[PDB]
Design a protein around this ligand. Structure first.
Ligand SMILES: NC(=O)C1=CN([C@@H]2O[C@H](COP(=O)(O)OP(=O)(O)OC[C@H]3O[C@@H](n4cnc5c(N)ncnc54)[C@H](OP(=O)(O)O)[C@@H]3O)[C@@H](O)[C@H]2O)C=CC1
Ligand SMILES: NC(=O)C1=CN([C@@H]2O[C@H](COP(=O)(O)OP(=O)(O)OC[C@H]3O[C@@H](n4cnc5c(N)ncnc54)[C@H](OP(=O)(O)O)[C@@H]3O)[C@@H](O)[C@H]2O)C=CC1
Ligand SMILES: NC(=O)C1=CN([C@@H]2O[C@H](COP(=O)(O)OP(=O)(O)OC[C@H]3O[C@@H](n4cnc5c(N)ncnc54)[C@H](OP(=O)(O)O)[C@@H]3O)[C@@H](O)[C@H]2O)C=CC1
Ligand SMILES: NC(=O)C1=CN([C@@H]2O[C@H](COP(=O)(O)OP(=O)(O)OC[C@H]3O[C@@H](n4cnc5c(N)ncnc54)[C@H](OP(=O)(O)O)[C@@H]3O)[C@@H](O)[C@H]2O)C=CC1
Ligand SMILES: [Cl-]
Ligand SMILES: [Cl-]
Ligand SMILES: [Cl-]
Ligand SMILES: [Cl-]
Ligand SMILES: [Cl-]
Ligand SMILES: [Cl-]
Ligand SMILES: [K+]
Ligand SMILES: [K+]
Ligand SMILES: [K+]
Ligand SMILES: [K+]
Lengths: 304, 304, 304, 304
């Protein structure tokens, strides 16, 4: 498999490329940047190759700054952007416009924030099928919520299944109705009352801003999440993950929006959107999140 | 960690010892048999050591036929017996009686059938704490039910959590109320109606007899299951697994019986018994299974 | 990839199939036996599927008793035979004769003893390329010799590279000239004088007889070795292993014989035979072993 | 085990900590920086915990800016310094002076360049045993040289054993006399003549400058190397690696210097220094490198 990383000079692009070459299913990683940063990509290329030697893993690292260098990749990772919607939306247009004409079987993974809005932009400008364009969305938010619950019940992480749907932002929605420990609904689990869901969600929603103001931004957490998504797709693992995808009325008839939703992912991208049944309160928060994401998408498309 | 395998000359003992030495957490495996089969254990010792060399793994393989050779082990696996209750119950008495006096921190894993009944016998004769004596029970039955459901929904196996409680036999009880795919109750999952639970359970309950009449008995399936249980305990993984354990009124006030139940397992054995809430029908089948196991336990203890 | 195991009903066939289905690169394992053992193979199929469920791994297990069931396999493992040369030579002819006509891209690995002689038989009757027919040979013997050396120097096993070439029998030849620890020739390694080469070779060459008279035969060591060889080929790993291969004058001009030699192995079978340079004594032992293997092969071919 | 990283705010400290927490043998990672960078370390702690959640791995991440926060660690990694010898020598003294008084069983790995010189400084100021203070040295340089050789012969990387001893700089010395492929001396290996040793050494020694002028510095290669060394020590793997260690006359009677040499590494640090035998030319280059490292170390000690 060949994976291109656009924005490899950045904090997220460099880290994600380094850990992506360690995957056995990734035979080639192509580093893409603007023409004025190709020299920087040469240094990163040797750095990554040195790390592969240390790990006794193999991968071909290439560099490019043109459309022909990454359009034929199996998976294209979009990590380039300013760390709002207006500026990053143009960058998506520059790189992904018309990709379907050349490689109609491409899969695009969008990391640039706003991830939900820019997934819609990428799908529209690219012309690819709706199942082949996705974004990281709330995947990492769901994973960290999973750890918090597991520690509360003092169980192995694999025992906890949970999810955060909606926008990768303040309008995210934890789905308690579909949270389980060992298959047991968490509501019926002893000790659930002592778990402060509201406090835990606040940790999830605010950790992004705290990391930015102190460290500068997320590099390792997001890069590992991208590794999870790419490995799942390229190995056709068919896991139900929470990614930003185009809704076409599978959940409450809500359609024409890209937002974090449960999706069974494989080599063909989004095989299907799981039609989860939400409770009253969860549905109300989900609808509020969808309305917020749709208005932002309106602004982005106008800027394009 | 040191693990002793009593009955290493048999189909289950030999296979389980071979795969147990491959675990990184298993530094020594002691092969225990009757004095008239020590010579056979010498051949098996070199065979296993040859396999470790092929796998580039390390482990010390010892042999013994006396109490002093295995009483100080961290985990003792009881695979010796005829492949009913009366004959195998005496064998449990011979090897495990009084083990608490010498090593009170021992953990006993019982595989000899009837596993549920013989777990009670082993706990009584050994004098160990009720949390340090367990049996394989319905762990493998739950794992195979897990695979059948995963293939039905065409999802990764890790997405499916399910369980079979009760006797390792005809009175086993699948717990649909605590079965989930991605955290979603399977009842709310689209396509659940097309899954034939009754047919699938019949496959689980009868595969044992079909294997016996054709191949002779289970060797690889059960041996791998034992590897799962021992790895979980020695690495303190704290997974919720289905093993035969002593109930003391955690489920519906049913007490004084050993039967397959959900249990969080760690280095200390059964940390706790998950107090699952069952539905009407599931509770009725569970009570029928408990009554059957209790009568069999009555016969066994009398024989001792 | 699909791997067929002829003789799956046996000790070596059953065990090798069980561990081969655990490899991620093996998607299907076909169990082949004589027609009067199909029912036994049904039980072995259910047992192995139980182990896969316990290990959370996936593979399709098929059953067959006809040529059409295994001729299209990528790798065919020959474990069927009496546990000599005359009787087993006929068995090889029955199964492998003309295989090139149907699947010319097949790879045959021969385990039935005499392994070197029957590797020659399989190549002749099959009509396959000389690089697509090999045998286990001295791979496991070299592996155990490697462990003994590593323990002597108290170093990690990966640090020791060594090999035993020639017949898988009494005429095997350890190659000290090409034995190294960390890249340092073992002769120059401190403590090499305290290593009793004669004692170590005695343990390796006789362990087969010791195991047979007590346990019955080699089961786990050989099964793991088959897993090693098949994984190496199917993943095109290009490791230098000691397998029985057809010599065409790469070592001292010796040709027209199958015997254990260093060979770089990949998806195309034997990519090349390493032209090792032997010392005087080592070469004389190699010629003695070749003489024994050639005479035995002549007798086998006469039996047809 | 607990591993402390001094300089976690830097490119090497942050990256090394992120990959060190992924090791199963590392239960705690402590991030150490100057007091004015504690807030930045808080963000790095949250980011790394996010990566652990994504990777389904567990580890406790702590923060500190005082000696008491890291003196009781099992392994202390020194990545703090200006990216020469005079300024960095003071930094080493501040952190490691007197560490033996509090935790005499600590192991110090020095990464700050000049690595060889500062390894000597750390050993002197700490008062620790000569076997408990080491440096990264030429481990990564040897690893990349190993990959280049493997690609030339088109063999698996595990088949190549090689090392570069001496200074981690322009006076490094490749040891062809102790380079082997599959146990065969590389000089006797077919195709060795087509290998341009001078070209390969040029790539290894200069890649550091090439990376610095474009990317800024080494980040991923060195971070992975630290993970390699720490895992080797904490799991008592007994691998022969090339690290900066105190020579006491094991190689040509050269003593009173820290420089890259083959060393068998375990939980006790440097178990022993392999007394490699060098050829005429290789030994002369080794003496030249020792002369350079000794003069630089003299200058450093004067700076205190
Ligand atoms: N999923 C999440 O929650 C997270 C998402 N992100 C998103 O990733 C994006 C960048 O993150 P980060 O990499 O940390 O920011 P950086 O500034 O560190 O990296 C910026 C990248 O974008 C490229 N770039 C900037 N402007 C342009 C342009 N006009 N045309 C083409 N390429 C351009 C840069 O190339 P050059 O080297 O030439 O500048 C560089 O590769 C942001 O949108 C951020 O929100 C990041 C972290 C967390
Ligand atoms: N969990 C499950 O569902 C399964 C459980 N099992 C149970 O495992 C047990 C044996 O399985 P298997 O190993 O296939 O049967 P085998 O007969 O193949 O192995 C029998 C073992 O028991 C030992 N043994 C027999 N009689 C005595 C005795 N009187 N005193 C001491 N040791 C004795 C044998 O030693 P010697 O070599 O001297 O005979 C041998 O080690 C049975 O109880 C069977 O039900 C097995 C498969 C599946
Ligand atoms: N290092 C090595 O290379 C080693 C190789 N081996 C070899 O492995 C082979 C099998 O060992 P093992 O499996 O223990 O012996 P088993 O008798 O236990 O297994 C015999 C297998 O051969 C099959 N078989 C027997 N006779 C015939 C026949 N006439 N035609 C076709 N198939 C037949 C049987 O099938 P059914 O049940 O239908 O008869 C069964 O699957 C032996 O040749 C042995 O030498 C073993 C150890 C070391
Ligand atoms: N193969 C090898 O051995 C290699 C080693 N290295 C070495 O790694 C070291 C760091 O490289 P890098 O991390 O990229 O450089 P950075 O400047 O990116 O990181 C510098 C680190 O040093 C700390 N630091 C700087 N000045 C002082 C001081 N006066 N007292 C205490 N701590 C201080 C900083 O902490 P703060 O943010 O608080 O200042 C920061 O954590 C360098 O010495 C470099 O030579 C690098 C490449 C190869
Ligand atoms: Cl998710
Ligand atoms: Cl279970
Ligand atoms: Cl096995
Ligand atoms: Cl080999
Ligand atoms: Cl990283
Ligand atoms: Cl090294
Ligand atoms: K790779
Ligand atoms: K082990
Ligand atoms: K498989
Ligand atoms: K860890």
């Amino acid at each position: 498999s060949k994976v291109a990383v656009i924005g490899a000079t950045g904090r997220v692009g460099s880290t994600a490329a380094a850990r992506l070459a360690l995957l056995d299913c990734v035979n080639e990683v192509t580093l893409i940047a603007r023409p004025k940063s190709v020299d920087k990509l040469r240094g990163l290329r040797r750095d990554i190759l040195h790390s592969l030697a240390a790990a006794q893993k193999d991968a071909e690292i290439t560099i490019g700054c043109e459309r022909d260098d990454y359009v034929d990749a199996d998976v294209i990772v979009m990590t380039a952007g300013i760390p709002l919607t207006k500026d990053n939306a143009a960058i998506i247009k520059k790189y992904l416009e018309g990709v379907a004409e050349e490689n109609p079987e491409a899969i695009v993974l969008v990391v640039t924030n706003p991830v939900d809005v820019l997934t819609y932009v990428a799908l529209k400008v690219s012309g690819l099928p709706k199942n082949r364009v996705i974004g990281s969305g709330t995947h990492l938010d769901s994973m960290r919520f999973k750890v918090l619950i597991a520690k509360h019940f003092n169980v192995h992480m694999s025992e906890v299944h949970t999810r955060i749907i909606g926008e990768h932002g303040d309008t995210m929605v934890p789905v308690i109705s579909s949270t389980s420990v060992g298959g047991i609904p968490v509501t019926r689990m002893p000790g659930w009352e002592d778990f402060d869901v509201e406090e835990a969600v606040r940790e999830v929603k605010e950790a992004g801003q705290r990391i930015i103001e102190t460290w500068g931004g997320t590099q390792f957490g997001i890069a590992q999440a991208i590794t999870n998504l790419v490995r799942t797709i390229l190995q056709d693992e068919r896991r139900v993950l929470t990614v930003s995808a185009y809704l076409d009325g599978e959940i409450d008839g809500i359609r024409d929006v890209c937002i974090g939703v449960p999706a069974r992912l494989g080599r063909e991208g989004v095989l299907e959107i799981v039609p989860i049944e939400l409770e009253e309160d969860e549905m109300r928060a989900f609808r509020r999140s969808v309305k917020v994401v749709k208005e932002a998408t309106r602004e982005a498309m106008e800027a394009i």
